[PDB]
Design a protein around this motif. Structure first.
Motif, PDB file in Angstrom:
ATOM      1  N   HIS A  26      -1.961  -3.415   9.365  1.00  0.00           N
ATOM      2  CA  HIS A  26      -0.771  -3.095   8.578  1.00  0.00           C
ATOM      3  C   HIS A  26      -0.198  -4.363   7.945  1.00  0.00           C
ATOM      4  N   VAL A  27       0.577  -5.107   8.726  1.00  0.00           N
ATOM      5  CA  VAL A  27       1.114  -6.383   8.277  1.00  0.00           C
ATOM      6  C   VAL A  27      -0.036  -7.365   8.070  1.00  0.00           C
ATOM      7  N   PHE A  31      -0.084 -11.391   4.294  1.00  0.00           N
ATOM      8  CA  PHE A  31      -0.420 -12.806   4.372  1.00  0.00           C
ATOM      9  C   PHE A  31      -1.807 -13.044   3.791  1.00  0.00           C
ATOM     10  N   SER A  32      -2.738 -12.150   4.110  1.00  0.00           N
ATOM     11  CA  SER A  32      -4.090 -12.236   3.579  1.00  0.00           C
ATOM     12  C   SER A  32      -4.200 -12.122   2.065  1.00  0.00           C
ATOM     13  CB  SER A  32      -5.014 -11.202   4.238  1.00  0.00           C
ATOM     14  N   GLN A  80      11.096 -10.049  12.327  1.00  0.00           N
ATOM     15  CA  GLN A  80       9.787  -9.780  11.743  1.00  0.00           C
ATOM     16  C   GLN A  80       8.885 -11.008  11.821  1.00  0.00           C
ATOM     17  N   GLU A  81       7.628 -10.791  12.191  1.00  0.00           N
ATOM     18  CA  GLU A  81       6.662 -11.876  12.304  1.00  0.00           C
ATOM     19  C   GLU A  81       5.883 -12.055  11.005  1.00  0.00           C
ATOM     20  N   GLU A  82       6.079 -11.130  10.072  1.00  0.00           N
ATOM     21  CA  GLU A  82       5.396 -11.183   8.784  1.00  0.00           C
ATOM     22  C   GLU A  82       6.292 -11.788   7.709  1.00  0.00           C
TER      23      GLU A  82
ATOM     24  N   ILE B  51      13.307  -1.141   6.079  1.00  0.00           N
ATOM     25  CA  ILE B  51      12.811  -0.405   4.906  1.00  0.00           C
ATOM     26  C   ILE B  51      11.465   0.231   5.213  1.00  0.00           C
ATOM     27  N   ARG B  52      10.623  -0.472   6.004  1.00  0.00           N
ATOM     28  CA  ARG B  52       9.375   0.036   6.521  1.00  0.00           C
ATOM     29  C   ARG B  52       9.532   1.230   7.449  1.00  0.00           C
TER      30      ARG B  52
END
Lengths: 94, 65
Positions: A26-27, A31-32, A80-82, B51-52
């Motif tokens: 998902h996340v 980044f990728s 959030q880690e993303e 939002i997710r």
């Protein structure tokens, strides 16, 4: 020459791989796509989006936003880690 | 080049000059919103991330935001 070269090198591996990644979850993928910008932003589609366009910019934006997140970074993440990872990239010292 | 548009900006600069700001440190807007970290209540208590998905944020963190 090297930039695009590096991309081509990390291709096929990011190719079908990141492909599934997207068509999956998902996340991280966010980044990728950044390792691969406009298509990634369009797929992701507000505040993060404006900061993402500063990537490819070697501008002294780094430090500011960096330290900014960072503290408040863990503040939100710690508990959030993303988002911290994207900030680590724009710090320029990942 | 555009004097007509620049005149609009002078009006904007004037409208901004006469704007009402709430207080920082003498109203509940910022004095009482001096939380040490962002989303401390949602981090301490389970209940782009909202939002997710749906419900996460604690009522206090939304009030503070």
């Amino acid at each position: 020459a090297f930039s695009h070269w590096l991309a081509h090198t990390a291709e096929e591996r990011i190719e079908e791989e990141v492909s599934l990644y997207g068509p999956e979850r998902h996340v991280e993928a966010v980044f990728s796509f950044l390792t691969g910008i406009s298509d990634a932003c369009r797929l992701a589609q507000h505040r993060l989006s404006l900061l993402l366009s500063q990537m490819v910019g070697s501008q002294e934006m780094r430090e500011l936003i960096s330290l900014q997140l960072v503290d408040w970074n863990k503040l939100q993440v710690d508990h959030q880690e993303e988002r911290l990872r994207v900030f680590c990239l724009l710090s320029g010292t990942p | 080049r555009d004097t007509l548009v620049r005149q609009s900006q002078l009006v904007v600069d004037w409208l901004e000059s006469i704007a009402k700001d709430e207080v920082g440190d003498f109203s509940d807007n910022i004095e009482y919103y001096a939380k040490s970290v962002y989303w401390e209540n949602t981090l301490h208590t389970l209940k782009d991330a909202p939002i997710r998905q749906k419900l996460p944020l604690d009522d206090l963190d939304r009030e503070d935001d």
